[PDB]
Design a protein around this ligand. Structure first.
Ligand code: NA
Ligand code: NA
Lengths: 35, 265, 87, 267, 88, 34
């Protein structure tokens, strides 16, 4: 059992990666192949 | 655990679309260039491929010191990429639309970046200033020159382990103490004259109790508790211990850059 | 206004006036270019400014901010030098 | 007003990445095809450019009926696109990763889609079934054959005004009443065995009050109200939303209210 | 946990002898189609359409129990079978 | 405008911004260089 504020931070960072990094990494990588 | 948080902060990326400014003298129209920018790093350190891209369509006489702007605002390169985005564009839709410029450098808004040595010096100036607040410079001064170089190469080469093998020493503190002397933080806000707020703040109180994020904010910027408190693209609880944040959610420069932005709609 | 005391670390030309009263919003870079003139130094020549005799502050940093964090006795001591005195 | 909601629903787009299955035999490397899918339409109706794309890199002897799958789950072409995404991939990172196949069509998981006429037949069946619940089939079985085509052409050609010129007739009800006879809905849930829940439910209460989305769920799916998301067209409407209004403004073009019950995102 | 199904014919299709059946609620239209084809001596390739309310043709993967609760009448679900598209 | 209707309009606009607007240009560009 980790504190609630620490659990919140971990989830928020993973939420962020999903909305930001993971949404664009593949398409950007694929776009640069055909550039 | 705590290490997974370090890795997630370190490997944070921001999808970005670099478009060439339309008034740049070019032999042909250039295509927009997409790139995943590292949050923890600097524009003039990670955009070599971008510079090469837009220079293919330009004469050697037309090129100069490159610079970037978002929505008219010149992007200060010495501010970490993640901070710039959280402060300026986190409200807008992805990807980050950055406009690439060459001609007409804004002398009064940005600091020139003549070399990658200029970036290293600035990065080191932030670390040494941080350790001055945390340990009265004691920890960072007792390192060999090779350790300073490794900290830099770790950031430049995106090597988490290489970087943290040295940076771990800067997060230590006396056993008799429960944190650093002062916490290195800079609070940014778009609707203020000052570039940022940086004051002396102790992580522990008279009781030996840990000050929270909220405690810091109530002290140095109470006009933020309607507004959003963002660090590394996330909004941590106000009850979060400041000492832990400083150890885990700081940028590689050992500073805790905090964005105060209006709540979107 | 911030009271600033300038101290030299050789081999560096010495400022004739070492005690200055500057605005809070003035930058380190603004002071470097300010001092360079008095020392008869051109742009290409380098001049480092140090706080607490340990770190060279960022050139964008404001004097006032540095005072609140590292100022003592009602003033901010800055050491200047043509070489890297401290790392 | 309400018409703005109708447009927002109609023009719903899902960023999708089509990737050719690893074990398909290709003449050369196949590039993934990116596409904005219409939420309200069907996969086999809007993916001609996708089909043409991957067929270029395949021998004629190796091309078959095309079929799609998400994380090992064959996508039923007869479910609206928005439903499939909401139900299967809403909590995953964008874009929607759909794998394109040709060989080994899963007979037990998918109905064949042999032609676009098959699609139009399925779409008209759904409309007819919906209108049976709404007006005892009185509105749609009294329309001209010309109107049944305008509905279809409206859907196929992404023509909003053309579709609603006819569909608005199906969204009206007699003056003395305050809603349809029964509301056409389907409740989907991956954890459950049954494909979907569809029962009879009147939009107006005894005392003449409008039933809500919450009332409907309380009545036909109480288990979804303890922790779960109630997702319609990719959004989570308030439970207090009038069910009659929802049926009118958040139905798919098939006139059904397709509702997904999904777990809340982990992170 | 079964429901009554009354099968009515729309020519020209072979007629069922036994028209009243007690069927599992989870049985689909297609499983019911294949059940009928064997009685009417119809092969797999030959199409057999099934209608509800003499109005629409439900999807072959649609369960009968659901169709009953929505479109049943007097304790039974009436289904018309035909070898062509009777109603559109 | 009722509380629940305002909610739906806002959510639909939020949905489009996140799902369509974010990908529209990049997909359009990728489709060209193909
Ligand atoms: Na953008
Ligand atoms: Na995905």
């Amino acid at each position: 059992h980790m504190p609630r504020w620490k659990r919140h931070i971990s989830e928020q960072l993973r939420r962020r990666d999903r909305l930001q990094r993971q949404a664009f990494e593949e398409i950007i990588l694929q776009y640069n192949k055909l550039l | 655990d705590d290490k997974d948080v370090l890795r997630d902060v370190w490997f944070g990326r921001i999808p970005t679309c670099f478009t060439l400014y339309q008034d740049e003298i070019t032999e042909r129209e250039a295509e927009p260039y997409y790139l995943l920018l590292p949050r923890v790093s600097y524009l003039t350190l990670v955009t070599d491929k971008v510079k090469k891209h837009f220079q293919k369509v330009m004469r050697q006489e037309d090129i100069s010191e490159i610079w970037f702007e978002y929505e008219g605002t010149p992007l200060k390169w010495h501010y970490p990429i993640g901070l710039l985005f959280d402060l300026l564009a986190s409200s807008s839709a992805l990807p980050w639309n950055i406009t690439v410029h060459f001609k007409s450098f804004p002398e009064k808004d940005l600091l020139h970046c003549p070399s990658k040595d200029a970036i290293e010096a600035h990065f080191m100036s932030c670390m040494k200033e941080a350790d001055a607040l945390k340990h009265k410079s004691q920890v960072i001064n007792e390192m060999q020159k090779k350790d300073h170089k490794q900290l830099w190469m770790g950031l430049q080469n995106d090597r988490f382990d290489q970087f943290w093998a040295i940076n771990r020493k800067l997060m230590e503190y006396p056993a008799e103490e429960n944190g650093f002397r002062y916490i290195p933080f800079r609070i940014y806000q778009t609707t203020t004259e000052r570039p940022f707020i940086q004051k002396l703040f102790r992580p522990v109180a008279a009781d030996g109790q840990l000050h929270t994020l909220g405690d810091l904010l109530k002290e140095v910027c109470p006009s933020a508790i309607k507004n959003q408190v963002m660090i590394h693209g996330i909004e941590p609880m106000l009850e979060t211990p400041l000492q832990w944040l400083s150890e885990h959610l700081s940028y590689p420069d050992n500073f805790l850059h905090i964005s105060i932005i209006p709540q979107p709609t | 206004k911030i009271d600033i005391l300038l101290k030299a670390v050789g081999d560096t030309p010495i400022m004739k006036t070492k005690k200055w009263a500057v605005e809070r919003t003035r930058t380190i870079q603004g002071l470097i270019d300010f001092i360079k003139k008095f020392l008869k130094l051109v742009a290409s020549e380098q001049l480092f400014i140090y706080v607490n005799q340990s770190f060279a502050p960022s050139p964008d940093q404001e004097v006032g901010t540095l005072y609140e964090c590292f100022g003592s006795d009602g003033k901010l001591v800055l050491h200047y030098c043509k070489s890297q005195a401290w790392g």
